[PDB]
Design a protein around this ligand. Sequence first.
Ligand SMILES: NC(=O)c1ccc[n+]([C@@H]2O[C@H](COP(=O)([O-])OP(=O)(O)OC[C@H]3O[C@@H](n4cnc5c(N)ncnc54)[C@H](O)[C@@H]3O)[C@@H](O)[C@H]2O)c1
Ligand SMILES: NC(=O)c1ccc[n+]([C@@H]2O[C@H](COP(=O)([O-])OP(=O)(O)OC[C@H]3O[C@@H](n4cnc5c(N)ncnc54)[C@H](O)[C@@H]3O)[C@@H](O)[C@H]2O)c1
Ligand SMILES: NC(=O)c1ccc[n+]([C@@H]2O[C@H](COP(=O)([O-])OP(=O)(O)OC[C@H]3O[C@@H](n4cnc5c(N)ncnc54)[C@H](O)[C@@H]3O)[C@@H](O)[C@H]2O)c1
Ligand SMILES: NC(=O)c1ccc[n+]([C@@H]2O[C@H](COP(=O)([O-])OP(=O)(O)OC[C@H]3O[C@@H](n4cnc5c(N)ncnc54)[C@H](O)[C@@H]3O)[C@@H](O)[C@H]2O)c1
Lengths: 318, 313, 313, 313
Amino acid sequence: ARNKIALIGSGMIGGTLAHLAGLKELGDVVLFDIAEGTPQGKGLDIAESSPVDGFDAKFTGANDYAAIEGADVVIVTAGVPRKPGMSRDDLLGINLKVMEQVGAGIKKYAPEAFVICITNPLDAMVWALQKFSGLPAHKVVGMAGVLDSARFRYFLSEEFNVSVEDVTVFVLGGHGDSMVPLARYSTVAGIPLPDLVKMGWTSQDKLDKIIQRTRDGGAEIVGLLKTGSAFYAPAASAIQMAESYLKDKKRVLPVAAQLSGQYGVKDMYVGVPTVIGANGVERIIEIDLDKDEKAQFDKSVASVAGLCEACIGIAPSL
Amino acid sequence: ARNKIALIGSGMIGGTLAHLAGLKELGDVVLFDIAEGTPQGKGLDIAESSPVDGFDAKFTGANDYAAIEGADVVIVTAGVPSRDDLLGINLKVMEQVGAGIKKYAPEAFVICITNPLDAMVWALQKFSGLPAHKVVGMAGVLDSARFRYFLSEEFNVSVEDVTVFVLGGHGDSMVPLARYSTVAGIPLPDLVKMGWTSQDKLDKIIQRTRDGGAEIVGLLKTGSAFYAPAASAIQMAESYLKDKKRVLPVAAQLSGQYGVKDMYVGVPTVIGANGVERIIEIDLDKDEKAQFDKSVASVAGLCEACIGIAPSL
Amino acid sequence: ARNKIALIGSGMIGGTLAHLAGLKELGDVVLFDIAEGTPQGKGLDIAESSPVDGFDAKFTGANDYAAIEGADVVIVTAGVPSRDDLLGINLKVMEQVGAGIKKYAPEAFVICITNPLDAMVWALQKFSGLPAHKVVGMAGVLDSARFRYFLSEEFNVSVEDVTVFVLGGHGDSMVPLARYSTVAGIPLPDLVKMGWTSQDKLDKIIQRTRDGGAEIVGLLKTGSAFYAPAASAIQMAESYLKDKKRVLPVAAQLSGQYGVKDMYVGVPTVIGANGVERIIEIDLDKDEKAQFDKSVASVAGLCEACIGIAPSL
Amino acid sequence: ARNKIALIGSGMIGGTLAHLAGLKELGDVVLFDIAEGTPQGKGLDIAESSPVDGFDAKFTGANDYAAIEGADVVIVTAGVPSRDDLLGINLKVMEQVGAGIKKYAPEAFVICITNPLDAMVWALQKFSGLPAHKVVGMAGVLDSARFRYFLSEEFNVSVEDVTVFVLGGHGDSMVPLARYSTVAGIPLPDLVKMGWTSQDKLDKIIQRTRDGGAEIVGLLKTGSAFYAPAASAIQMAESYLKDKKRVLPVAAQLSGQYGVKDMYVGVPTVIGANGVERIIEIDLDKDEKAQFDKSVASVAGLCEACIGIAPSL
Ligand SMILES: NC(=O)c1ccc[n+]([C@@H]2O[C@H](COP(=O)([O-])OP(=O)(O)OC[C@H]3O[C@@H](n4cnc5c(N)ncnc54)[C@H](O)[C@@H]3O)[C@@H](O)[C@H]2O)c1
Ligand SMILES: NC(=O)c1ccc[n+]([C@@H]2O[C@H](COP(=O)([O-])OP(=O)(O)OC[C@H]3O[C@@H](n4cnc5c(N)ncnc54)[C@H](O)[C@@H]3O)[C@@H](O)[C@H]2O)c1
Ligand SMILES: NC(=O)c1ccc[n+]([C@@H]2O[C@H](COP(=O)([O-])OP(=O)(O)OC[C@H]3O[C@@H](n4cnc5c(N)ncnc54)[C@H](O)[C@@H]3O)[C@@H](O)[C@H]2O)c1
Ligand SMILES: NC(=O)c1ccc[n+]([C@@H]2O[C@H](COP(=O)([O-])OP(=O)(O)OC[C@H]3O[C@@H](n4cnc5c(N)ncnc54)[C@H](O)[C@@H]3O)[C@@H](O)[C@H]2O)c1
């Protein structure tokens, strides 16, 4: 029988996840949304594209959670944006409620799924989502690092004029100010960035500007598109996480995972390097940070706790 | 020198074309549009996604036609969605696009998607002045894709083992040939005799193909199909770039085949490094010929109208 | 957990099978053989190739059947290349492989490539006791692959657009159906009428497909074909593993279809997660029916020769 | 047109190159060899496989160098498995191969695989007289692949998340840099501290990488590795053909970098549409410098023996 992949949210990222899941033959897809028609339409559109490329996959649009029954992977993009100066508490209120509905859906119909959360704000929403759903935490993760890592790698490849395949980056934490990059564990062909700077490939000021561009990467795309946000690279990033699970690949990926002691964090979701295989998060890799790195990490973890506490405020259920 | 692909139009189809061209490593990509920001944002988003799968391609977003200079392939989705109003709006778009290509990409293989397809690609090759064998319209591959998918469902077999044969345009102007459509080489009428489905059901599947575009519009509400149309045009671009010589149903200029001259019609073509290298002229029976003729006459009308807006044609 | 694919025999075909399974990411691979060193060697070599393209798959070489335990797919190329000496040697190999499969991989989909194919797959399902819908032989896809390749060269079109239809086995036992072979849905006889080729040329192509294996042996001198056969089996494996429901010519057990019972014969099948899910039974004309029966009678003879050797059957 | 890839040598490596080149749609392929039938047979066998997977590529087996005319990439495996006797035999081959490339493919990117590699590639570019930035030796990619595979097993992670950095050639001439080899950006020496492994186990993996080729020869008994060597050369070719600018360890001509002039050594290179577009010059510590200089000295030694046997150089 084929793997089944449910996508909870059929907006621009949802649709892109479906298309990539077909192209890559990851299994049958269910596109779920509250909007009537959108998931049916995209699903059929993608299904109609399939003979051109030759992949055999079912695409079902649904407005009911029962459609996701037995899904091997669920990818959650359902939620609302920060439109445009609405409150920070307003946002959390709407998306926490969505995390509660989705969490009930998955618990009922797809309890054994590997769940990948994309909904913002990520570190909090994925934390709310595993509490609300009750799934084992090693089976519920947030996508954030792979995306930041993709942007950073892309910018470095431009800066150095080498393949994106030969750039490696190491990032912890979440997006924006919460990102904690390690330049010293980032490389071209294994040559660490500091050594590349020593050799003149680029300057420290330029590397810093590239790191900042990475922090602001989501907002840059918003600024160019105006009416929506990034969907191609976010979709690609989550599909890479799903693929590592489906194929038991044991990729080492930066993902929002539940820490239970590591880096001195407990009962919370933080962007860390994880090995993702057929049993979800199989190992969380604990590096030995230096004093500056530790400071920035502890600052990032504290900022995420603050958000989680705001969520407990609005939804004390948690 | 990488191949260069220019996408004129950075809407939903344009973006999907760019993503596929990236994923399939077809070359560097330029997203053109009149709307500032959109091409640039989609291009950067796709570029940023590239480390994930590891394709190396440049994605440039542009608002100036000069950006398409030297493009090996150009895919045109520009246009807007009164019959003589939409024609006049879209003809003017073909006019600009034609001028752009003439100036900056004269050696390109050009694939037109803008509706109404047969009239638009016909106008576009006149406006651009490019050799007709290098200017084609995508329509058949999309209709053929929908029809195969529906048959795949009905018969519960792989999409890869269904072949269908279509002439003409979309909707009422489509001319399918059941007898030249098959599963593993067994023609549809033989499949019906074997009990794989009924004629009534086959007829409904043909009708569903006719209405296929309107079906997706009714489900999406705010816009139209873009995955299957994007995939269909990429297939045509890929056959050119790789000199594959696939036999694809495409809007091409006929010059005597099927008794048609100086007109674009959906016909079976072999597409290779030289563009349209061959047009296949099949022997239509009486009823097929009548359907094909009605279809060509209807394309003739749209063209006559276009002449009566832009006498330049 | 990943799919597991067990390859019984690690010669040139087995190694190619392993490499293709790797590149296509069909799952973990077990190479099995008697020759010491060989399977462990090719497995390691392929494994060490894996970081280049980035596929993650285990390659285990083994000289003992226990390594194949729980295989989702087993592909058997084991055997040796007088007629009653060939049947005797390979019958004994089919017996050893069958008990191996019975003991360790009873739920596997099994694909037999050992010659003479139609008799050995029939022997293999009897010895193994596996359900028949789960034991098939590879022959039709290989013949069909060659035939399509020759036609693509003749017509100068993509291999993707040529479909051929073949029943029976290799050589003189092949029964091709020109009327169910096409280019983009146009049957070969109709392509002859358009002047794309002649009937003489088609006949030579058909004879070339009958002799296609001997041709490669005649070029190589010291061995036989392995790339096309390997690719052919992998397509079969893949349709099973991905539940594609491709319609493929395969040696399958008939039980009434075409008038044949308790015998394996090359027929069109639908291959999906349950193995052979349907045997397609087309309406043969009088001459096809006669050619089919002659081919079936010939296979009946080989099987009778086997029962005389191994009354177990 | 399509890219053209000429394979000089149609043994096990050459056939695998041709298979990979077809599968990955890198272009048309010419298999060359002095042996009659072999290249024709492998070419035909692979071509006959093409309809299964659907790649469109021509395969030509030839026994005359004129067949390679116009080749964009040439991959040389020609050769033979007394040290001065081996150098004498294989230098003869590089002279003949050099003469054919010079006459028929003077604009090719040439990838040399024939042993002993750093001497033979050096010799090949002198005999052929092609620009040095267009003639390279494949060695480092293969060592890097084995090394990354062994580490991937060691730590139970994807092969895609291991990076290794290697200078020099094979065996004792290899100069790995543990500090520039990683999992997910974490260097080998730090992994030891974090207790993921021990220094003693790293050392064994390094030694295993040095003996990797001999390890495969021991398992196969009667030949040497061909899957990983073929994958490695294809990666290099592909970086040229698709202008990827991959950072690959390759035998390249140094002209000052690392203190070496007019000699081929394994170094980090950026390979793009112009061949070796950059040679990366890292900052070696004193022990790495001594290791590297010892390795370079042993390559200079071989080149001198070569001049002994062929003063021409
Ligand atoms: N984490 C990251 O790295 C990252 C990057 C980019 C975007 N995002 C986030 O992804 C989310 C969506 O992305 P998008 O571009 O598809 O936006 P979108 O608004 O187009 O998608 C949201 C979809 O969710 C549906 N929805 C709304 N409420 C729902 C509910 N209660 N139940 C089920 N479905 C519901 C909507 O109908 C809509 O189709 C946003 O929250 C955005 O911030 C995250
Ligand atoms: N032939 C077929 O089978 C087929 C199928 C589906 C859709 N279509 C057609 O494809 C076209 C585009 O589809 P879409 O879904 O991407 O719509 P879309 O509106 O999302 O894309 C059109 C884009 O073109 C731009 N545009 C308008 N005028 C322009 C100009 N003069 N120069 C540059 N850009 C201009 C718009 O700003 C917009 O971004 C439509 O005409 C549609 O009917 C054809
Ligand atoms: N059916 C077809 O359409 C078709 C086409 C081409 C070739 N073939 C057949 O493919 C088969 C193998 O081709 P190849 O390239 O692998 O040749 P090969 O000799 O390289 O492979 C045969 C392998 O089987 C092993 N073997 C021998 N006896 C065994 C036993 N009792 N148990 C287990 N293993 C045993 C050998 O050690 C050898 O490694 C041949 O039988 C040939 O006739 C079939
Ligand atoms: N440098 C590396 O990293 C590396 C790694 C592995 C193997 N190798 C070497 O690669 C070479 C190829 O190995 P293989 O598996 O293909 O061996 P093989 O013996 O199977 O292939 C050699 C082929 O070259 C042919 N040949 C001999 N002399 C020739 C000539 N003058 N002109 C043209 N063809 C000639 C032979 O007929 C044969 O078909 C071997 O020399 C091996 O030592 C190098």
